[PDB]
């Protein structure tokens, strides 16, 4: 079990860790989060009491270093940092634990939600979408735009998701225009899976990462990317059987976890109705369709 200590909490903030959150009052004696499960990525995120604008946070993996949070009064945010002196860190954490100034990552033992939402998400891939190689962790916030969004303005702060565009030469073979536009299996299997992502795990990892940035930060370009990666699969007549079964499981846990009150802006009617009721895979997503109908039958 690993720990992210906080130097202090000088401003009132709602702190998230994965799917959990808690309110911390201004100058409340809060000094971090312990018992974080090893073996998964995590995201710690912040929404200031005073400016609910800008949700922001940090993707990290405790196996890659000792990380802490410290507020910066100049830049006005909680920053992640790495402590390279391991003894200084163990010593700080142990003192905070002894004074019980830390919250416990409150994982119910029956619960596999976090594993199921991050199954294919790997820090090494996160760090290639979020480019900042001097840190082992990754900052994301509400307002960061994607490579693709910029094409249609600061590159250093972009989300470098894989560009997917159904009406692009990449997507459409010369001479197969109507075949490839109506049945994207070429674009999925040859271009994306075999060509760009190498395997379905890396595909699913980007898809799950895009969903999580949409949900946690309201990051709109992330939401666009999550839906585009779903639609590419749903619109391919020919998809490996194992991919479709895993997709159903992936999407199920994403819909399950979505706040019921955010379904208006995080879910794209056209994509979901096409994917569940009109696409080639209209019959291959039983769990996802069952939960969508019982939870958001209005959207449909």
């Amino acid at each position: 079990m690993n720990t992210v200590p906080f130097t202090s909490a000088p401003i009132e903030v709602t702190i998230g860790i994965d799917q959990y959150s808690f309110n911390v009052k201004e100058n409340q004696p809060f000094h971090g989060i312990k018992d974080i499960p090893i073996g998964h990525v995590h995201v710690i995120h912040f929404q200031h009491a005073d400016n609910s604008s800008m949700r922001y946070g940090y993707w990290f993996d405790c196996r890659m270093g000792n990380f802490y949070i410290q507020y910066d009064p100049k830049d006005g945010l909680y920053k992640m940092m790495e402590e390279r002196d391991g003894a200084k860190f163990e010593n700080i954490v142990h003192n905070f634990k002894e004074r019980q100034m830390m919250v416990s990552y409150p994982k119910i033992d029956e619960d596999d939600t976090w594993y199921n939402l991050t199954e294919f998400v790997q820090m090494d891939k996160i760090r290639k979408i979020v480019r900042k190689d001097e840190n082992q962790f990754s900052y994301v916030d509400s307002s960061m735009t994607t490579v693709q969004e910029n094409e249609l303005s600061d590159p250093a702060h972009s989300l470098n998701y894989t560009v997917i565009n159904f009406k692009s030469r990449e997507a459409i073979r010369p001479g197969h225009e109507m075949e490839d536009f109506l049945d994207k299996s070429y674009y999925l299997n040859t271009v994306m899976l075999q060509g760009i992502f190498k395997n379905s795990s890396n595909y699913f990892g980007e898809l799950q990462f895009a969903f999580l940035n949409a949900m946690f930060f309201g990051n709109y370009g992330s939401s666009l990317q999550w839906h585009a990666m779903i639609e590419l699969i749903c619109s391919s007549a020919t998809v490996p059987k194992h991919m479709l079964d895993k997709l159903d499981e992936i999407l199920y846990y994403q819909i399950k976890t979505l706040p019921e009150q955010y379904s208006d802006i995080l879910l794209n009617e056209r994509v979901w109705n096409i994917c569940l009721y009109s696409s080639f895979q209209k019959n291959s997503l039983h769990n996802t369709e069952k939960i969508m109908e019982n939870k958001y039958p209005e959207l449909l």
Partner: protein, 237 residues
Amino acid sequence: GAMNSSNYAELFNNDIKLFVDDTNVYRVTVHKTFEGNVATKAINGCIFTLNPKTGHLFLKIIHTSVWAGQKRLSQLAKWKTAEEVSALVRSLPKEEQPKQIIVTRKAMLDPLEVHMLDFPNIAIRPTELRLPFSAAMSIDKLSDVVMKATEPQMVLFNIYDDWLDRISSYTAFSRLTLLLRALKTNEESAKMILLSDPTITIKSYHLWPSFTDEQWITIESQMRDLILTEYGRKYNV
């Protein structure tokens, strides 16, 4: 953007553009089978690709063999159209390629966009106008060359005959659409108007009769009356 009443004059400026109408590409007669069921038999069609400034018409005749053994013909028809328009642009010299292509039916936008990916600088636009180009097969010479074709064939026509020697493109397009709107609302009456006087003939190299200016004004009036009537006869007014 879309083409409508407000940007109407843009059709006659000096940027090359074409309309594509696909209504007559996939054409069928529906009949009864011996077992009392219903079947279609395709007949020849065409694409109607028109320069509204110059009158140049690229009539691409769609032979019934193109449908042989194919499924979902109404959807295939849009992509065939798009394929044939794209082949047409590619065949034209660079200085003759359009800067815009306006489709008369929004269902052509995606098929033509995809076929034209190699032409990123050619704008594919829909329109809000209810243009009467489906009636192009009421023009006897065009109807004749389509039905007679025994293979795929491009035929070239000026749909304005010689009118531009005397009138502007704005006025030539207004005449053409009035004629085609009349032919669409009541073909029999429209054709009666055009041929009633046996002394007015159609040149061998023209589609319409050789009317004087004064006679065109009479003809145009008669076509307006027809369209208003049929709007009465239809709506009882």
